[PDB]
Amino acid sequence: TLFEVVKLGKSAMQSVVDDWIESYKQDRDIALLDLINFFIQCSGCRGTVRIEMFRNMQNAEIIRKMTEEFDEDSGDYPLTMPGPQWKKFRSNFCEFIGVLIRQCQYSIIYDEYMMDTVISLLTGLSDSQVRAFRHTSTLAAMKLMTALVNVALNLSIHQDNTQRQYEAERNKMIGKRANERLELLLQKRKELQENQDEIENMMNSIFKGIFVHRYRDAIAEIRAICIEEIGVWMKMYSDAFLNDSYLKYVGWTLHDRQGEVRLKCLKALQSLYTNRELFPKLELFTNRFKDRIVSMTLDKEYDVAVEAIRLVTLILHGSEEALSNEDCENVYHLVYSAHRPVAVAAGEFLHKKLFSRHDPQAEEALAKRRGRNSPNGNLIRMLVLFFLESELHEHAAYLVDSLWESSQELLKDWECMTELLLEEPVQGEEAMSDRQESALIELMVCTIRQAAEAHPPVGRGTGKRVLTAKERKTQIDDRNKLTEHFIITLPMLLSKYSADAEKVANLLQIPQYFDLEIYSTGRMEKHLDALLKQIKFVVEKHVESDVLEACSKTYSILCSEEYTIQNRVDIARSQLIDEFVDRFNHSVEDLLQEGEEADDDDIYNVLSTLKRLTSFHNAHDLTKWDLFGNCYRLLKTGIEHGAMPEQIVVQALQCSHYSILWQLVKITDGSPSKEDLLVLRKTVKSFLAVCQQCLSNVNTPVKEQAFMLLCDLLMIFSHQLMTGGREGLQPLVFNPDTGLQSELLSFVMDHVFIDQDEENQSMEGDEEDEANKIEALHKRRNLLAAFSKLIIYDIVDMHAAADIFKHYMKYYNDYGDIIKETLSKTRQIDKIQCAKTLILSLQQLFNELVQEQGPNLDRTSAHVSGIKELARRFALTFGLDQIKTREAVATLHKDGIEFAFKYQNQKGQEYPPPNLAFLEVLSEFSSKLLRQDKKTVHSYLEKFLTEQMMERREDVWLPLISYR
Amino acid sequence: VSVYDFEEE
């Protein structure tokens, strides 16, 4: 029971190896029988070899008999059964072969007895048609010959030692005992020579009998295992295996059609590089198969791509010859891979390759920094140039993430490119180009944001991140050093780049990652205030919405009341908003009157000031300066006149909404009054009238903004306002208007559910520019999402959302996610009414079909097929999933039956029902999901039918037949 | 290069 002893938890593998050695010394036949029985029961054959049947009759008929006597209960074999107990079985099996053959290498392995039978049986079973026998025999003989390779290595070392001692004696001819030692060494050398010849004989026998047959085998895993292990051997025994005689098989196997075999080929090739260099035949094969290696860089499997990139890195360690510049740019594009390990491997290769200004990839004192503020400048320089040439990305986020861990020491040396950006270093280089300036600033944005937060961006995200102590302490002192460095650098950074809008927008994302109590410890609030005045100059010099958003977000980050500086920053915030209030009042009180003219200058001043006010009012409570009077006067004169720019109205509407929501903030504070409550409700009602007028206004972005503002107003006054333990907010609650609901539905249908260019309510996007179709599609998805969010929270009538549910196939790619989620949520809110509106959606589509085609309805057309497919996916959306499972199905069936006989035919004939093809739609909802309620639904169905309708069975009433 | 020319069977 050596199979069971090795399998079922062997305490010491060398112990049973020595037991087999002792039994072999006792009697060769019984130990050979035990080893053969072990191998056969390792093959999955439950037959047991006996003494006479092993001794007398040959191995091929043994193989035939055990094929007949396999005695299976399943097709599985011990190399593929689930895991644990069998995994450690396989490991024990391999270790038993290795230790058993390697331990006998001194005296037992030259008896010329066991290996003949073992080789014959294993070769025959590797030529056997049974996959189990082939796999098990290949593994057994494969570990056998691996052990024989180790024995050959030991014999070669012994030959080297005895040759050295023979030459050492041949130096010294003095001594008769020395001559006797020389003759003993010669006899030992001859014994080792004949032992080596025998080992070579069994080596060649096993090789030409097994490996040549089984690397052409139809099983991928046998070839993969063979190639991986042959690379292991050629890594460890390069004396005889490092030649083309074994590399021809590797070259032939590199073109395998299976990913795992090629993975093992790349592992073998890396084993030729790891960890020793250099060999000429290795570089010859590298230059021979550079094209195949770069082919595997773009393989389907991510693992094969990673191994190919690592082999390329190994070649760069060893050769620097075979790789071409186009291959280099291919890997530079692989830096932008979606899969993070591939990108990180490519970035590590890039760091190894293109960074040799003063680092020779060698020892220090000239490699990291030469004690000056200059050596690392050129590394920064081809970072900038690489970002310039990499036109596959406007941002170096993926590039920096790939180059993060490989260049950790280089990416924290922010002071170096800081002097190479602002203060004109002593290197005598050219002027820092504006495109290069923006590229370097984008690189800094990426590097410091990855310095603060360590999570990779979206697509590279994992969510299974754990922070070690080293990680968190590196994060903290990294935060400290960036804080103290950049509170110094940002003042003259802004002073150099005040007028550059995009550079300011990029630079003001870092202060989200600044520990503000360090200012209290560092006493650098004065530099904070200098940067506040500098960004005040930017704000008063820039009118861009994006930079105002960035500034407002930066202020909100530094408006952290948990830090002492909140008063000091609130000084500057109040000062700047007070300036903007004064400027807004001065400009508005002259713009609202007609006068002369109003010209473009006053329009520009009003628009810029209101942009700034709206932007800084989004993130900050500024209702102490009640400018809703000016904004509402501007909105009402926009209503009355209508001849003035769009953006001013957009800014006024958004600023008024911001004021309203900031007032809404300070009523849930536990102190609600009533006079200001009614005042706020009246202002909200006026804002609702203005928003309805703007929705009726001809301008379509104004229509969308009015729609989303109305969405915000309705969710503010939604039914879930009463959830959070509120009592006095009940007067504030305002119900939707049915005409307003119809206007909203009409707007949504005219401006959302469009997938063609015929409507012309969606901007073109044909040219692959910043004005692509994707922006319009995502904006329409956002508007539909806001509308559905109003729908699902008991605010607006969801019979209007039935018309949204009906568009699930015409807009599957565009809005199928939104329609499916809305249907699921409305099912979770009220499944009965959800099913009623679902069958209403089907009725609406069917009535559109009635309008388009008439009462014949074209029952075999694509429209009916699409409606029936929609019915199928709706029926599988139901079932036993929520409460009132079949009651909703019964209600849907009753509604469908009512609709199928809703209209009666005037001519030809009275009993044929119009809208009969809806029974085909309902037949998908009947199917076989239910069984007991089918009788009740049929009883409801037969109320509208007659016996004359029962008896007729033709093409017109085929929907009725299919439903019944 | 001629040893790597596959002519087996």
- The 3-class secondary structure across A709-765, one letter per residue, is HHHHHHHHCCHHHHCCCCCCCHHHCCCCCHHHHHHHHHHHHHHCCCCCCCCCCCCCC
In whole angstroms, what is the distance from residue A55 CA to residue A834 CA? 80
DSSP assigned state of A209: I
Please report residues of B whose CB lies closer than 8 A to that of A244.
3-4
Distance from the Cα of residue A12 to its chain's centroid: 45
How many angstroms separate the CA of residue B5 from the nearest CA in chain A?
9
CA atoms within 13 A on the CB side of A436: 15
A949-952: Cβ within 8 A, 24+ apart: A949/A911, A949/A913, A952/A911
Q: Please judge whether B3 and A252 are an interchain contact, meaning their C-beta atoms are less than 8 angstroms apart.
A: no
Give A417's contacts (C-beta < 8 A, 6+ positions apart): A377, A380, A440, A444
- Among chain A residues, the shortest Cα distance to B1 is held by A244
Q: Which technique? A: cryo-EM
Please report residues of A whose CB lies closer than 8 A to that of B5.
none
Spell out the alpha helix ranges (H) of A43-130. Answer: 51-55, 59-68, 84-103, 114-126
Give A349's contacts (C-beta < 8 A, 6+ positions apart): A309, A312, A313, A316, A331
How many angstroms separate the CA of residue A778 from the nearest CA in chain B?
57
Q: Is A333 on the interface with B (CB under 8 A)?
A: no
First to last CA, chain A: 67
Cβ distance A199 to A237 under 8 Å?
A: no
Helix axes A566-591, A600-618, angle to 10 degrees: 150
Assigned token pair, A614: 């709206």
Please report residues of B whose CB lies closer than 8 A to that of A208.
none
- Among chain B residues, the shortest Cα distance to A248 is held by B4
* Tokens 């990426």 -> residue: A446
How many angstroms separate the CA of residue B6 from the nearest CA in chain A?
9
Cβ distance A875 to A924 under 8 Å?
A: yes
Best A208, A213, A248 residue to mutate vs chain B (most B CBs within 10 Å): A248
Cβ distance A289 to A251 under 8 Å?
A: yes
Cβ distance A622 to A668 under 8 Å?
A: no
Best B3, B7, B9 residue to mutate vs chain A (most A CBs within 10 Å): B3
- Among chain B residues, the shortest Cα distance to A284 is held by B1
Closest CA to A706 of A778, A634, A656, A773: A656
Cβ distance A942 to A902 under 8 Å?
A: no
First to last CA, chain B: 19
Q: Please judge whether A251 and B6 are an interchain contact, meaning their C-beta atoms are less than 8 angstroms apart.
A: no
Q: Is A251 on the interface with B (CB under 8 A)?
A: yes
CA dihedral A456, A458, A463, A465 (to 10 degrees): 0
Q: E strands within A587-735?
A: none
In whole angstroms, what is the distance from residue A173 CA to residue A58 CA? 56
- The Cα-based distances of A584 to A576, A597, A628, A638, A826 in angstroms read 12, 18, 12, 17, 46
* Tokens 């009246």 -> residue: A682
Exposure class string for A53-65: b at 16+ Cβ within 10 A, else e: ebeeeebeebbee
| Torsional sign, CA A640, A646, A647, A653 | positive
In whole angstroms, what is the distance from residue A577 CA to residue A319 CA? 64
- Among chain A residues, the shortest Cα distance to B5 is held by A248
Please report residues of A whose CB lies closer than 8 A to that of B4.
244, 248, 251
Assigned token pair, A954: 């033709």
In whole angstroms, what is the distance from residue A267 CA to residue A234 CA? 12
Nearest Cβ partner for B6 among A244, A245, A252: A252
In whole angstroms, what is the distance from residue A902 CA to residue B1 CA? 85
**Backbone region of residue A854 per phi and psi (left: phi > 0; alpha: psi in -120 to 50; beta: other values):** left
Please report residues of B whose CB lies closer than 8 A to that of A248.
3-4
A645-651: Cβ within 8 A, 24+ apart: A645/A603, A645/A607, A646/A699, A646/A701, A646/A702, A647/A607, A647/A611, A648/A603, A648/A606, A648/A607, A648/A610, A649/A694, A649/A702, A650/A701, A650/A702, A650/A705, A651/A607, A651/A610, A651/A611, A651/A613, A651/A614
Work out the burial of residue A866: count CB atoms within 10 Å of its CB; fewer than 13 is exposed, 13-18 middle, 19 or more buried: middle
CA atoms within 13 A on the CB side of A903: 12
Closest CA to A894 of A933, A853, A932: A933
Q: Is B5 on the interface with A (CB under 8 A)?
A: no
Please report residues of B whose CB lies closer than 8 A to that of A213.
none
Cβ distance A193 to A159 under 8 Å?
A: yes
Please report residues of B whose CB lies closer than 8 A to that of A245.
3
Closest CA to A787 of A747, A732, A839: A747
Q: Please judge whether B6 and A244 are an interchain contact, meaning their C-beta atoms are less than 8 angstroms apart.
A: no
- Resolution, rounded to a tenth of an Å? 6.5
How many angstroms separate the CA of residue B1 from the nearest CA in chain A?
10
Q: Is B6 on the interface with A (CB under 8 A)?
A: yes
Cβ distance A334 to A294 under 8 Å?
A: no
Q: Is B2 on the interface with A (CB under 8 A)?
A: no
Size of interface A-B (CB pairs under 8 A): 7
How many angstroms separate the CA of residue A266 from the nearest CA in chain B?
19
In whole angstroms, what is the distance from residue A658 CA to residue A612 CA? 13
What is the maximum span of chain A, computed from C-alpha positions, in angstroms? 134
Please report residues of A whose CB lies closer than 8 A to that of B3.
244-245, 248
Give A67's contacts (C-beta < 8 A, 6+ positions apart): A128, A129, A130, A133
**Backbone region of residue A48 per phi and psi (left: phi > 0; alpha: psi in -120 to 50; beta: other values):** beta
In whole angstroms, what is the distance from residue A315 CA to residue A288 CA? 13
How many angstroms separate the CA of residue A248 from the nearest CA in chain B?
6
How many angstroms separate the CA of residue B4 from the nearest CA in chain A?
6
Please report residues of B whose CB lies closer than 8 A to that of A285.
none
In whole angstroms, what is the distance from residue A878 CA to residue A943 CA? 26
How many angstroms separate the CA of residue A132 from the nearest CA in chain B?
27
User: Is residue A790 within a helix (H) or strand (E), and if so which, with residue range?
Assistant: helix A773-792
What Rg do the C-alpha atoms of chain B give, in angstroms?
Answer: 6
φ/ψ of residue A290, rounded to 5? -60, -40
How many angstroms separate the CA of residue B3 from the nearest CA in chain A?
8
How many angstroms separate the CA of residue B7 from the nearest CA in chain A?
12
Please report residues of A whose CB lies closer than 8 A to that of B6.
252
Assigned token pair, A296: 């595997």
Cβ distance A633 to A588 under 8 Å?
A: yes
In whole angstroms, what is the distance from residue A183 CA to residue A187 CA? 6
SS3 label, residue A834? helix
Q: Please judge whether A251 and B3 are an interchain contact, meaning their C-beta atoms are less than 8 angstroms apart.
A: no
DSSP assigned state of A902: S
Q: Is A255 on the interface with B (CB under 8 A)?
A: no
In whole angstroms, what is the distance from residue A227 CA to residue A381 CA? 44
Cβ distance A918 to A842 under 8 Å?
A: yes
